[PDB]
Amino acid sequence: IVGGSTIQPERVDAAALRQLGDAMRKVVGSADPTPLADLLSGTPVDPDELTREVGADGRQALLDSGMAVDDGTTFSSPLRGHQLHGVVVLSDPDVEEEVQHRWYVDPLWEADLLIRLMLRRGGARALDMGCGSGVLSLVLADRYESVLGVDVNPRAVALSRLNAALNGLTNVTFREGDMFEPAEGRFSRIVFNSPTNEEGNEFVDLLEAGEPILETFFRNVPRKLESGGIVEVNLAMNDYPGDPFRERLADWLGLTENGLRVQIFTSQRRATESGGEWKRGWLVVAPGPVGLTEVEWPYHDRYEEDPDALLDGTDR
Ligand SMILES: Nc1ncnc2c1ncn2[C@@H]1O[C@H](CSCC[C@H](N)C(=O)O)[C@@H](O)[C@H]1O
Numbered sequence: 001i002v003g004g005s006t007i008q009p010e011r012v013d014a015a016a017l018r019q020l021g022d023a024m025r026k027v028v029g030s031a032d033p034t035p036l037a038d039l040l041s042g043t044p045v046d047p048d049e050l051t052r053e054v055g056a057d058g059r060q061a062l063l064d065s066g067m068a069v070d071d072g073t074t075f076s077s078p079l080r081g082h083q084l085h086g087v088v089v090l091s092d093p094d095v096e097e098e099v100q101h102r103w104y105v106d107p108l109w110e111a112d113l114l115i116r117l118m119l120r121r122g123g124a125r126a127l128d129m130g131c132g133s134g135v136l137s138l139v140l141a142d143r144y145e146s147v148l149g150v151d152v153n154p155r156a157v158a159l160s161r162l163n164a165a166l167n168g169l170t171n172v173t174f175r176e177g178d179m180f181e182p183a184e185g186r187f188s189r190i191v192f193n194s195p196t197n198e199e200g201n202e203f204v205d206l207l208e209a210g211e212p213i214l215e216t217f218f219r220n221v222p223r224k225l226e227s228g229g230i231v232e233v234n235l236a237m238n239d240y241p242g243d244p245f246r247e248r249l250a251d252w253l254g255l256t257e258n259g260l261r262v263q264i265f266t267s268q269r270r271a272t273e274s275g276g277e278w279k280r281g282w283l284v285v286a287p288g289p290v291g292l293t294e295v296e297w298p299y300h301d302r303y304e305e306d307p308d309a310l311l312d313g314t315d316r
Helices: 014-027 035-039 047-065 111-117 135-140 154-166 211-224 245-253 299-305
Strands: 080-084 087-091 123-129 144-151 172-176 187-193 225-239 261-271 277-285 291-296
Touching (some): 014 047, 014 087, 014 154, 035 047, 087 135, 111 135, 111 299, 123 135, 135 154, 135 172, 135 187, 144 187, 154 172, 211 245, 245 277
Parallel strands (some): 123 144, 123 187, 187 225
Antiparallel strands (some): 261 277
């Protein structure tokens, strides 16, 4: 069972974590792994080998935070390391449903693609809804004065905090709660990698929560959004016969009443049982002429042929 491990950044000095992050930056994601990079790739490691790379203090920091577990003879990590877009991130290893804990954290399935779709501009205050590992928040922290990440999974909140400390980031905060409840005030930027995929209307789990989580999100967005703010959402959308997602969305957003502009970029689609249609896409709320537009953008395809330059893309 994966994703129930205890994560406790609060039990380590901020400096020790910052140094560990420095060490990880040198090796995570690079060829010829050192013992630290081996540890964070899921390989058990002799602790004296770690000692020479992170110090005995670093070694004790790894234990105290929950990043490492002492199997007597060796150390092992329940987490896996990533490095991308200027940040080091720990998350759960990519494993199948049957062995996931209820607090399993998104193992960065779509993060790198999503970061590349995001408008490159920065601003005053950003919100990362369902922050998971915290990866989107950490990237946003570089160009926002402050960033709040929220999740209902307490373990995601702890991991997010740890990941911010590892990167020595000071302007990013994380709170446990349900949707917007722990997010006070308005935001000039809201990003939401939604937990929607194949489940349609039905709650399966925190990573497939059903369409209602989008309804809640979009019904409340208008009161959480600063004038001129931007909203970006990864989501799965179900068009049913005589019942397109986009009409439900416009209803939720009070589109004309609140005077918002929404663009939906569809990347993938398939026919469904109903004679309806499933789609995956990227939704953007941004200042301009009121209304809703649908465009095609096979960014998943383009990401596969050449990741390194979708790019963005939406700025257009
Ligand atoms: N009611 C709710 N309130 C806040 N977050 C929720 C929620 N229901 C599900 N979530 C969270 O939404 C996230 C979706 S996965 C997104 C994770 C992260 N932003 C990434 O891009 O990798 C999960 O972390 C899940 O725990």
